[PDB]
Design a binder for this molecule. Structure first.
Ligand code: HDD
Ligand code: HDD
Ligand code: HDD
Ligand SMILES: [Mg+2]
Ligand SMILES: [Mg+2]
Lengths: 747, 747, 83, 167
């Protein structure tokens, strides 16, 4: 190709000398377009370069610390221009390196100290900027300023995460996900630090290091990474039935979300809203995804940790670059103070959910994530979220897990972020005023001019000053809850019920979701080396539901005892057997915008098919990847030159939502193992497949009969009807009816 | 089963109370046997518990800091017995947590500060204890005490690593591997800090942060983890042809070793040996694996990062637990001082290898790794290796990469290990005496009694004292190399040759190894978004070898120009076109001992087949895993009860070296998709497969005709010849002749 | 945590108890103690739940707080008796 | 950025009750206090500083290309710290000691630090001896005496054995 024969500018020792100067290609193809573009169309870029027009008050406030690069000299950190950044100073050009090379030592010193401690938990995470706006004033129930006015826009910074794995672990593990939101309000930073399930594993913070140690890699050998599928985790679970509720959620497809865009968020704890009249209302926080709920299947998720361990990080970044912004509705479950004891469960028990059938989630506002960071380390890694960061209008409860959390998230930053001035790191800074009498500490940025560093003081007329509580712009005062009791290390008896919420969850799942839960337990327990641990966990499952317990036992070669078969099922939850809001799929939601289809090309594609396909996908905001057996270009039957995004092996079916095969020269790919496997893998993972013309010959590799089956779209050409059928399948996410057919497929 | 129906001891609120007391099963099945056992037979354990009788002077010296557990009370760090480790102290059992709960706060504080910074590079690694002994005294060439006497045993601690990924990244990535050995000698710690290839990517340490930043996750979004397959890496490579030699090694199967036991190690740099008469000999260091050289194939390695990201860590630990100790022969390439300029390449250039055909590797000694650590964090994570840690009898050279390394590995520990007393962390302590006038620093353990903290001093009669250099037990003195040159930041012109060593490497590979190199480049470059970067790298390949360049270009849809087709090949290396020592496979080596075979069971296995299989494998030290469609047990035709190690999905073919299917009730598994896929995956990855009796029906799924083919062992029964054939195939590692057949296999 | 460089300050020799100390805490900067316990959590079966809680008692018993009665509202308020 | 209503009291269960862990205002304030101190300088820990400016009398371009010396139109801001050597940050000013005189020049072509003392020579010849010399003059390691003084055995021991120090 005339324009695709770029040669390197460096073939000789000029590569070891200063003055390499301009190295970009003359055609400017190094530079991504600063406009929204679909995934894969352009190289990804720092947010301020990709989308400079996207602004909010927090993003604007970071301009003071942003550093450019273009047209600047390369310098030391002291501002000294560097002449030769290719060589150390030596006594002769084959001599020893000299200690007086301060340029070398500065550069290597900085390198040598780049790493900071990762987060103890949730070390793996991906973040973005956005904004929040309430639908209406909530002043009747809370004096929180950010909820006071529908025209009030609050910048946010959100980090999604896994829990167990290190910062370098994989995205699509089976785990709980974190969902942490920093609201930069006019009356302070509010951090809503939640997860993607409505409960936690444990009741009291005192047990957190025990639980976390049990799930983390085992201490002798530091195995396994990003997995609960090991002896110590299931040992703890078997001995602590309080864990069973969140374990059920983790073993469900909730544990393997399709995207951070397609999961729910929950604050878990009951908090309080406090209004201007001092009235407290109990509240639990929810995030409802506009994109709907959707998850992978286990074999897919696991293999995807290999094929693309950055899949969720990548998808988040690319959605934002495409203008396909993650959106979530903030919702409140509201319970009057006088209803504290009206439920079968304790409101303060974080192992219990509040069913939406009993207490609906009331829509409060919307959050949109619309810009990626500039520097991952500076903005994501150094961000500090903490649930003790509340504002006037909010307060805590005595939830004993929450209570201990309040200690931890301040404490941990002292080592992680190097001292008590972590709020001065730019991403963590409030956008509202902050002034007090605190001084010094490592890496102190703020230079205080106050003559006084104490109060009360006369020498600065007692400024800065306390502010009385009030309806707006007032000081923080705790709700005057009545406390009556003896000093005890004692769990509330009201917390001592472990099986009814697991059963409620189980019965709320579709039959295929139940199968996936069974398979989750079965897979994980099969990796437990000590068989008695497997048996003890099966025994716990028998206290939840016998069908569940028998199905798992069968997969483990375990036989239940007669006594286990006669265990009395746990009670309903305030008269509820089930709640369909607990299922990912029972109630259809969301939409296909932002999903992706693989299009398997051949060397003479039927352009009419491809045109129809792409037009229909574009109309619904669905992306496409054009795949082939090599990179470069192929030419369609009408002479259209088609650029190839990836090879079949380079972008496996794991990475897409559906597969379409247009007609053309199908003989080119009919005996290609990778192309056949592409379809078999997608088939096994319940993805929609569409085959046009001679591509219908691929039905043989997936053992589909001439008459066809639901979930396989087929026609003479892609000009139907064909695309409507495929898009309808995509709206339903996966082809659950295919499950009985997949056991015979070798993939 | 009577004995396999263990029920949990906890179904009620006793789980939230003190006094849970004894929880181990009465049958004692929680405890692994303290004797060598094959992989999977027992739970893994800390080394001192698994192998208490395996000792060396370093292991013995750690006894002062080892902490037990059995029969001890649970305490705070201050020694206060804890009564209730289940609950926080609160005002009432539904009340707020109290600040006076010092037990909670201590436990949470320690948890909150568990993490330390990971290594800037080589963050992912796995380590073991062992010992080294020389074969004969090397006193004629070096006064190094640890090489002075064949009966002198030197304890070692070895850490193997990847380079790019975080501590939580996957093992079987495509990367360079580190191979770092701490020798606890009688005259000081010597750290031999090497990699698994004989050269590095860059020439001068000044470029190390540039190179590392280029290969690491890109700074905007922190993608990709554990991969060089991205734009910035290949950008740097295209602009820095000095990198091409180590890039060739990384793109070969050298980049994806089967095990840390089956790779070579290299010091890379030329160092000096100094004898008692003061004579210097140039030396390069080599480790030769007793188990031979062996690598995965890319599709397998990549998928294995998903199925088992801890595969190499696991395999190392389990080999040692089996008594199957990793062994490596230390070897020296020795060059007299007067031969410094004898070769086409500069001896000080770390991008150049010394061909074994020109300078043989002389065997010097043997190292055996024979015990795992007790605590991964304390021993592995906190270990500090540094190539500046040499001893009398060794010295440096002016290699400008080595020269800068000497600065970095001391510097980096100040943040990573929290200050200048990192040598006092138990794993890092010398076993020989260490005394000086250094004092204080964070976490100072040693309490100095010297009246003097300076020298010269009279008040302690000038102790501790300098020691003159001498033949044995003398002070360190540098070799008095003559230095003549001006102070310059300048690369030696002798370093300015970039293509001959890549070409030598290429021509030394077997045809299938060449294919794998082509496919490595092709796969990685296909993931580069900016096409001009791909083109620039292909241009560099055209300066190495046109067959290589054309093959990669074809896979990328790139056309070479007429000028590129006429690039003059680089010269031979001192008359050598090739050197078979550079191939993994050209010269057969190693041993099947420690390899593993999957045995695919059915519900009525022919016991005669299984017994013959297991006996033959055991005789050669090859392990087996018995796999089925569920866990538990199956019963063979003769009533033998067979415990199942894993399911087909739980321990995929990726994790084994070969697959054997005995006869029995083959109908049980003939239509099982997972069992069929097991064989297809193993077939695709070139692994030996053996099929007995009706198991030969599986030939259909791998498209093998009735007449059979090389690499598929088959017979009526698993007789003597059958197992001999299979083991012979295993000795050759993979069935390279099968490569043309795999493109049609959908797996 | 800042003054002595992390959570293992009790391992600095002068600070060490002379009586036994064992628990499930791990890691942290400059960790000296090398734990051999298969378990780093409780409750555990894999080490028969050692080290173990100790009930309160007359001698060698576990720490339990005196069960003082607390009655009042959550307030930031000085006792008038202090004025 | 959260406004404080009562900066006189901890949150407690009753006004004579226990302090509550949920008092984030108390814990933030005390945490910051608890971590105020950073390590002092190994030497010259005691010092006093001020801002100012420097200007050359004439261009020195004939002997140096340093931009800050190139023209009397270059006004260069400075920050200067004067110090003692031996004593801690909390030691006394008018001790018998060498004084440091360190000047940070914020030039248009980088920071130049002129890090000097108030005498024209130093005690020792080779940097390798610096920890020995400094340890000898500093408080003795058994009992950490004396502060801000060379008047003790170890200093004069070193001097007596190292005549290079005499100047
Ligand atoms: C007693 C300790 C403790 C307990 C009981 C919890 N956590 Fe936590 N959590 C931490 C101690 C902690 C921490 C150690 O403080 C982390 C890690 C480092 C950090 O900055 O906070 C953390 C991080 C962390 C993050 C990552 C924030 C980020 O992206 O930086 C999320 C989303 C959560 N947690 C969510 C929860 C939820 C929903 C919990 C229960 C409902 C929970 N944590 C219980
Ligand atoms: C100038 C800096 C620099 C350069 C040029 C190199 N390295 Fe390095 N290396 C480091 C700076 C460094 C480091 C930053 O100092 C590390 C990471 C943390 C540590 O303790 O040392 C390190 C770690 C490290 C480790 C891991 C040791 C362990 O397991 O803890 C190995 C095996 C190597 N390196 C090997 C090499 C080889 C074979 C090189 C070239 C021949 C090389 N390094 C060049
Ligand atoms: C090899 C080590 C070493 C040697 C030989 C010297 N110093 Fe130094 N000096 C340091 C190591 C050091 C240091 C440890 O790096 C300090 C303390 C902390 C710091 O920031 O620098 C320091 C601080 C320091 C300061 C205080 C700067 C400030 O106000 O922050 C002055 C004025 C000097 N020195 C002056 C000298 C002079 C005039 C010397 C000989 C002519 C000298 N030093 C030799
Ligand atoms: Mg032009
Ligand atoms: Mg005693």
């Amino acid at each position: 190709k005339n324009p695709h024969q770029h040669q390197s500018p460096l073939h000789d020792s000029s590569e070891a000398k200063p003055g390499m100067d301009s190295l970009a290609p003359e055609d400017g193809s190094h530079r991504p377009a600063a406009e929204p573009t679909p995934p894969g169309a352009q190289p990804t870029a720092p947010g301020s370069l990709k989308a400079p027009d996207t602004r909010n008050e927090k993003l604007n406030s970071l301009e003071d610390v942003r550093k450019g690069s273009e047209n600047y000299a390369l310098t030391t950190n002291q501002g000294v221009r560097i002449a030769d950044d290719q060589n150390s100073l030596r006594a002769g050009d084959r001599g020893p390196t000299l200690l007086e090379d301060f340029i070398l030592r500065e550069k290597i010193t900085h390198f040598d100290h780049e790493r900071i401690p990762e987060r103890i938990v949730h070390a793996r995470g991906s973040a973005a900027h956005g904004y929040f706006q309430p639908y209406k004033s909530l002043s009747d129930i809370t004096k929180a300023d950010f909820l006071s006015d529908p025209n009030k826009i609050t910048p946010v910074f959100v980090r999604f995460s896994t829990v167990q794995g290190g910062a370098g672990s994989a995205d699509t593990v089976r785990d709980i996900r974190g969902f942490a939101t920093k609201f930069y309000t006019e009356e302070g930073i509010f951090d809503l630090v939640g997860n993607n399930t409505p409960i936690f594993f444990i009741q009291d913070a005192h047990k957190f290091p025990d639980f976390v140690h049990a799930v983390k890699p085992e201490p002798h050998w530091a195995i396994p990474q990003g997995q609960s599928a090991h002896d110590t985790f299931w040992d703890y679970v078997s001995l602590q039935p309080e864990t069973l509720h969140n374990v059920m959620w983790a073993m469900s497809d909730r544990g393997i979300p399709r995207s951070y865009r397609t999961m729910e968020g929950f604050g878990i704890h009951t908090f309080r809203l406090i209004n201007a009249s001092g009235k407290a209302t109990f509240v639990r926080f929810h995030w409802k995804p506009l994109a709907g709920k959707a998850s992978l299947v286990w074999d897919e998720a696991q293999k995807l940790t290999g094929r693309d361990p950055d899949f969720h990080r990548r998808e988040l970044w690319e959605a934002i670059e495409a203008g396909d912004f993650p959106e979530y509705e903030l919702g409140f479950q509201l319970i009057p103070e006088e209803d504290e004891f009206k439920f079968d469960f304790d409101l303060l028990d974080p192992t219990k959910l509040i069913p939406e059938e009993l207490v609906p989630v009331q829509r409060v506002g919307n959050m949109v994530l619309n810009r990626n960071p500039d520097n991952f380390f500076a903005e994501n890694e150094q961000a500090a979220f903490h649930p003790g960061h509340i504002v006037p209008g909010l307060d805590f409860t005595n939830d004993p897990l929450l209570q201990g959390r309040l200690f931890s998230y301040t404490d941990t930053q002292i080592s992680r972020l190097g001292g008590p001035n972590f709020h001065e790191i730019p991403i963590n800074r409030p956008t509202c005023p902050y002034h007090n009498f605190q001084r010094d500490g490592m890496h102190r940025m703020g230079i205080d001019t106050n003559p006084a560093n104490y109060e009360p003081n006369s020498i600065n007329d007692n400024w800065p000053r306390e502010t009385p509580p009030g309806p707006k712009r007032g000081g923080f005062e705790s709700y005057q809850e009545r406390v009556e009791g003896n000093k005890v290390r004692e769990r509330s008896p009201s917390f001592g019920e472990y099986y009814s919420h697991p059963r409620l969850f189980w019965l709320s799942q579709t039959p295929f979701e139940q199968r996936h839960i069974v398979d989750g337990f079965s897979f994980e327990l099969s990796k437990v080396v000590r068989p008695y641990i497997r048996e003890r966990v099966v025994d716990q499952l028998a206290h939840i539901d016998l069908t569940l317990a028998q199905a798992v036992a069968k997969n483990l070669g375990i036989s239940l005892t007669d006594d286990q078969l006669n265990i009395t099922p746990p009670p309903d939850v305030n008269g509820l057997k089930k709640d369909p809001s607990l299922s990912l799929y029972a109630i259809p939601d969301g939409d296909v915008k932002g999903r992706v289809v693989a299009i398997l090309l051949n060397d003479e594609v039927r352009s009419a098919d491809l045109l129809a396909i792409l037009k229909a996908l574009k109309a619904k905001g669905v992306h496409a990847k054009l795949l082939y057996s090599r990179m470069g270009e192929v030419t369609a039957d009408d002479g259209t030159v088609l650029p190839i995004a990836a090879t079949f092996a380079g972008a496996p079916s794991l990475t897409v939502d559906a597969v379409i095969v247009p007609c053309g020269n199908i003989a080119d790919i009919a005996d290609n193992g990778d192309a056949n496997y592409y379809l078999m893998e997608a088939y096994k993972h319940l993805k929609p497949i569409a085959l046009a013309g001679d591509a219908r010959k691929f039905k043989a590799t997936i053992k589909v009969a001439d008459q066809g089956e639901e979930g396989i779209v087929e026609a003479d050409s892609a000009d139907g009807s064909f695309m409507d059928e495929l898009l309808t399948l995509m709206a339903a996410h996966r082809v659950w009816s295919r499950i009985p057919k997949i056991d015979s497929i070798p993939a």
